[PDB]
Curated annotation (Swiss-Prot), chain B:
Residue ranges, annotated region (APC-binding): 32-53
Parent sequence residues shown: 207 to 253 of 268
The protein's role, per its UniProt record: Plus-end tracking protein (+TIP) that binds to the plus-end of microtubules and regulates the dynamics of the microtubule cytoskeleton. Recruits other +TIP proteins to microtubules by binding to a conserved Ser-X-Leu-Pro (SXLP) motif in their polypeptide chains. Promotes cytoplasmic microtubule nucleation and elongation. Involved in mitotic spindle positioning by stabilizing microtubules and promoting dynamic connection between astral microtubules and the cortex during mitotic chromosome segregation.
Expression sites by tissue: Ubiquitously expressed.
EB1 C-terminal domain ranges (all copies): 19-64
Name of protein: Microtubule-associated protein RP/EB family member 1
Length: 61, 64
């Protein structure tokens, strides 16, 4: 019965992985689309800098 | 038979490691979209290119 409990937790975690990678690819696809649109204007350069920022933002507006 | 529960346990640990990395990558990409959205809102200057980027931001995936 311990097999039963751990197989259930593995399948719960695997479903969370699949939902996260679907949401990640959804956002990543838009970012690739926007880079193609940008591919010189200072506003578009700021957008390109956002695409290639090495860390998540934190600044309060 | 005894190693069966240990194998399911190990596969659960591998999936839990993927979650923590996927959440950071998800927040990383979503944060970029929020920043691009903010730049488009602040810019206004009747630019068709920025309007195309806004339409990409809010386009829906008929599959999601």
């Amino acid at each position: 019965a311990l097999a039963e409990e751990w197989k259930r937790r593995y399948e719960k975690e695997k479903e969370k992985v699949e939902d996260l990678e679907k949401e990640r690819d959804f956002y990543f696809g838009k970012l690739r689309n926007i880079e193609l649109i940008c591919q010189n204007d200072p506003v578009l350069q700021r957008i390109v800098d956002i695409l290639y920022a090495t860390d998540e933002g934190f600044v309060i507006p």
